């Protein structure tokens, strides 16, 4: 590891332990820094191209130019550091307090400081400010988005009155404490979002005229580079269209819509637009409609003006572009979905260039001025290779690292016959190929990710390898980084094609000598403890022993915007969700099951696996259970040994 | 079993499937009554000195005279049926519907019906009218009480808005919905109960002044004969305390205070006041003031003429008196703590007459007239034996009934060296001394139960049994039955001497050469689930697996009306507490330990387990555990079946 390794103006940097390294050699120590601060450490990069960071300390936050080696700003937010936004102006920072969004003005060292400004008041448990809404769907990962000269702020707000909550429960008081958790499940009326936009100069707020209907997904908040018009790819509750729409940030109105996308299964737009380098009329945009993630140039008026990448492969990461805005840079599975390299190509179109030729993982990092890369590279024969490149050519290795469980690798034919499905599989602690080993199956299967790549690599498969235990894993159809095709035959269906899959990775097992096939495993969390769940049941002849963590079981109590985009809504597709609904077979379990949540939850409600074992009573049937009081979907931290040692012991205990 | 054996004014009366017979023979079918309806079935008994009984139908209740063959009344209670208490006059029943208390009427056949009056309108979730107070302490199980004549309905408001709640939350619905459970934890603010009295001929109601502090237990409401007094015995928040007072019926006025008991360690009334046959200036009071439960007769002025009954052994159900007055019928332990017999003594006192020498456990239904008892009797040896008498003499019997597990039973030292123990266990099916047999410790060990005594038999130690594993149960000391001193040990110190107790049980089980001393286990529910625990978490090397279903592991987290009087508030004696909140000592778990418990239980709230794990998963300890969605504190009804299959595998999986 080079800790905290990234671009700063144009030199790069990483810490050790006392020093701040920078090379295009100086060195920047936590003694020099301390001298320069009021009353290596820990801090966030703002602004890579300036090197300015913001440093977390007790009573506030100072803002730092690691370039000028100089304190910008101090900001006082209260205490509140999760939902810190700050302006790319660099002396204002946003965040929401007590239900409220603020805005907060950095003060030059010794000039005093001032109040902070109240952008909303009316701020409820059921009215939520400047936060994620929409479950997080959609790429929305925060609700406050500057404009690009700061002069304004946007922000999301979620009227959720309408919704019917959950209760989430703290155990630790006295007397146990619930709190209301607004989670909209399949089928019911959704919150309604609407977009605000307060003008810094004039301390008025405009909201975006959205319009009907209200439940309408308002995602991929982009403000254009002269901050007069602000873009929205608003996406209906089917979730087959997405029209990327300008209104006007001054007045909120309509100004047109410039294009729409629609698809027989889904549309998820996922990306902001990003406007070319100087220019307020192009921009690009990712989107899968063609079947693949795509690169696409438009100008503002909605006219496309070329399919920028194309090919049977995804973009993976858009990098940016080089300074005149003639070159795109970016992360692809163009060599194989298996791998991940960075690839430059002409605006125009054409050949890509890749620029980590080396077979295995690349993470890459395009400098400020776009004319050099850092890299960091893993293959199974290479821990960790980091790079740095400047654009053609010379290549400049800044570090190479180089009994524990065999990983085997390789693929199978999917149940179609046709497609080609990859596995690994992590065989047991000194294994003897004379001898029988049982073997776990360890499912997700889910969309949105991909679990065999080609890495180096949390090390549950290689703890159970070390008590005598295979542990296989094949990325199932439904999976991600394969195109859309490969991704969408889930739909309406979910649990059915995925399960086909896994029993090819069955039949592949089955196929090995050395497989004790009467002592057949699984397990999986989220997804995965949906997948194994739907696997004991349907399978319970081949699944002896699985352990599911954060499982859903019924997908009527997912959430809406994860769960119709996939099933469509349970009104239109009952025998879809009839035939996933894991509690009309909790009769069919006929082998050792533990499932396990976290009580406080807010992705998969801990009423599925209650409900679970509620229906196993009624069946009579025999599952175990686990929950951790203090934990949401994860067990995360220290506790993760616990979780370990408790799945471990299941599978030790009973397969 | 002879379905509904019970008093109908001079003949005793049971059911034949289709006939309910009659004796002194007459009969009388299903279809006769069937004809007399106005559009053999289950019935309550409401007077049975007059033989009146309420049906209930399909559209409302039908009372009827059993005696004369005649309709009464029909009563119409909007399908109210839990809270029902009919008037002793028969004509009227008070109930609960939807937070308020009402009264209403009984319409003659054909003869139209009247609206019920609300007695109450401002009933709601935090002001509880006409039920149940105190958390069902000191003998309370309701919260309506007729005065004798039927004039007058007493009737309990609770005011509990300083009470913080906990959550019980429903998963069945769709999104799942918590609704709050006024449990009120120790050390914490109690409710307040007053106690109202509405007259029916004026339909004015008056408060009873009980004054200060707000929180005093208001128990054993008892009217006097003649309608003017209603006697309170109110209880201090320390239980030490209890005051027998009478009010004014008409103004709600303090009258006097009849008496006080005082104890050392806490008194407990559970029986109302009961007057003498024709008097309204004398009563018996139950009274465990001496060390053992005795009948106390008292005048209304507060003056003790006697003390009734004496000795070291308890009244055990107070069963009335003759005609005149002059003889007190009631169940007592004087022959053996293992077995009730019901007696005959003289008010004056002295010698007690056992009516049903038979060793073994007699319950005995003396007649309206007092002339006669039915004696249902089982004792190991004998099933089931019933008897009528025409007291002295003339017994006549009714019925006698005549591989599986033995049962042995006897006595072993408490950890004193002096105290007398009595122990049942149940050997393995198919028992074999030359083998070595598992055993499990089934416990209990809380106050007013006691587990041991000489009856024929809810059969787990069977079930275990025949799955090979010996089940042994001693009563320690803490339990019942054997007075005061026996039970009061445990005073502040919740577990200690019980647990010293439990391990005299394990001494003796292991010099038997056919246990087998390192596969002991422990199972218990309730104060039984804090035993299994404790047992586990002190003596780990003993005891290697168990399994506590509903158990106490926080005494603090104990509802305040039980758990002070045995520990004593938590800010009295954290000394104790601490030394049986199970949460501290979590990391002593190295066994096989599943906890149990329904997540709606309004007993022992699901926190206590819940806490348990969060405490096991910081201390790096690995419980087991399963939830009940549906059940409350016990797993009632055909579910049982799957609670006894997940404790007994559980047992057979790692003992």
Excluded at 296 to 317: A, C, P, S
Excluded at 424 to 439: E, G, I, N, R, S
Aim: proline letters at 5%; glycine letters at 10%; aromatic letters at 12%.
């Amino acid at each position: 590891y080079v800790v905290g390794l990234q671009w700063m103006g144009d030199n790069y940097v990483f810490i050790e332990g006392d020093d701040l390294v920078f090379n295009k050699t100086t060195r920047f120590s936590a003694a020099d820094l301390n001298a320069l601060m009021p009353e290596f450490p820990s801090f966030r990069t703002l602004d890579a191209g300036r090197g300015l960071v913001v440093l977390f300390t007790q009573g506030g936050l100072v803002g730092f130019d690691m370039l000028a080696r100089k304190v910008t700003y101090l900001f006082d937010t209260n205490e509140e550091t999760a939902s810190l936004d700050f302006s790319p102006v660099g002396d204002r920072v946003a965040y929401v307090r007590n239900h409220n969004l603020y805005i907060a003005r950095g003060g030059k060292l010794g000039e005093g400081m001032s109040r902070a400004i109240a952008v909303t008041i009316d701020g409820t448990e059921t009215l939520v400010y400047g936060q994620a809404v929409h479950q997080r769907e959609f790429g929305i990962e925060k609700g406050t988005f500057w404009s690009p000269k700061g002069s304004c702020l946007a922000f999301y707000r979620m009227d959720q009155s309408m919704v019917k909550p959950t209760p989430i429960v703290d155990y630790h008081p006295l007397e146990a404490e619930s709190k209301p958790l607004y989670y909209p499940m399949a089928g019911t009326p959704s919150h309604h979002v609407t977009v605000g936009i307060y003008h810094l100069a004039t301390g008025k707020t405009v909201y975006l005229q959205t319009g009907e209907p209200k439940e309408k997904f308002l995602t991929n908040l982009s403000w254009s580079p002269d901050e007069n018009i602000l873009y929205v790819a608003e996406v209906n509750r089917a979730q087959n269209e997405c029209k990327v729409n300008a209104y006007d940030a001054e007045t909120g109105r309509f100004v047109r819509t410039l294009f729409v996308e629609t698809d027989k299964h889904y549309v998820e737009p996922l990306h902001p637009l990003t406007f070319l380098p100087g220019s307020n009329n192009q921009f690009i945009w990712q989107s899968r409609r063609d079947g693949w993630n795509h690169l696409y140039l438009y100008d503002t008026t909605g006219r496309l003006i070329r399919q920028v990448t194309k090919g049977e492969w995804e973009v993976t990461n858009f990098a940016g572009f080089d300074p005149k805005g003639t070159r795109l840079y970016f992360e692809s599975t163009e060599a194989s979905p298996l791998e991940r390299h960075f690839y430059c190509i002409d605006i125009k179109g054409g050949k890509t260039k890749d620029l980590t030729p080396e077979s295995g993982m690349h993470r890459t990092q395009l400098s400020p001025d776009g004319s050099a890369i850092i890299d960091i590279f893993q293959s199974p024969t290479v821990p960790r290779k980091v790079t740095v490149t400047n654009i053609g050519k010379g290549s400049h290795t800044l570090l190479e690292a180089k009994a524990m469980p065999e990983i085997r690798t390789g693929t199978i034919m999917a149940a179609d016959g046709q497609t080609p499905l990859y596995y690994k599989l992590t065989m047991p602690l000194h294994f003897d190929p004379a001898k029988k080993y049982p073997v776990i199956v360890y499912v997700y299967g889910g969309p949105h990710a991909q679990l065999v790549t080609k890495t180096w690599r949390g090390g549950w498969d290689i703890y159970m390898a070390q008590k005598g235990y295979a542990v296989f894993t094949v990325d199932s159809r439904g999976s991600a980084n394969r195109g859309a095709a490969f991704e969408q035959v889930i739909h309406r269906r979910l649990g059915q094609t995925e399960m086909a899959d896994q029993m090819c990775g069955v039949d592949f097992l089955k196929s090995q000598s050395w497989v004790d096939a009467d002592r057949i495993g699984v397990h999986g969390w989220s997804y995965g403890g949906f997948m194994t769940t739907n696997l004991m049941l349907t399978h319970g002849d081949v699944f002896k022993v699985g352990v599911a963590g954060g499982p859903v079981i019924d997908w009527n109590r997912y959430a809406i915007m994860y769960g119709e985009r996939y099933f469509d809504a349970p009104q239109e597709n009952p025998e879809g969700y009839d035939a996933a609904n894991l509690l009309k077979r909790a009769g069919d379990l006929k082998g050792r099951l533990m499932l396990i949540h976290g009580a406080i939850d807010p992705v998969v409600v801990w009423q599925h696996s209650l409900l679970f074992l509620d229906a196993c009573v009624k069946a009579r049937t025999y599952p175990d259970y686990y929950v951790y009081p203090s934990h949401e979907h994860n067990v995360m931290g220290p506790d993760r040994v616990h979780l370990y040692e408790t799945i471990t012991r299941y599978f030790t205990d009973h397969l």
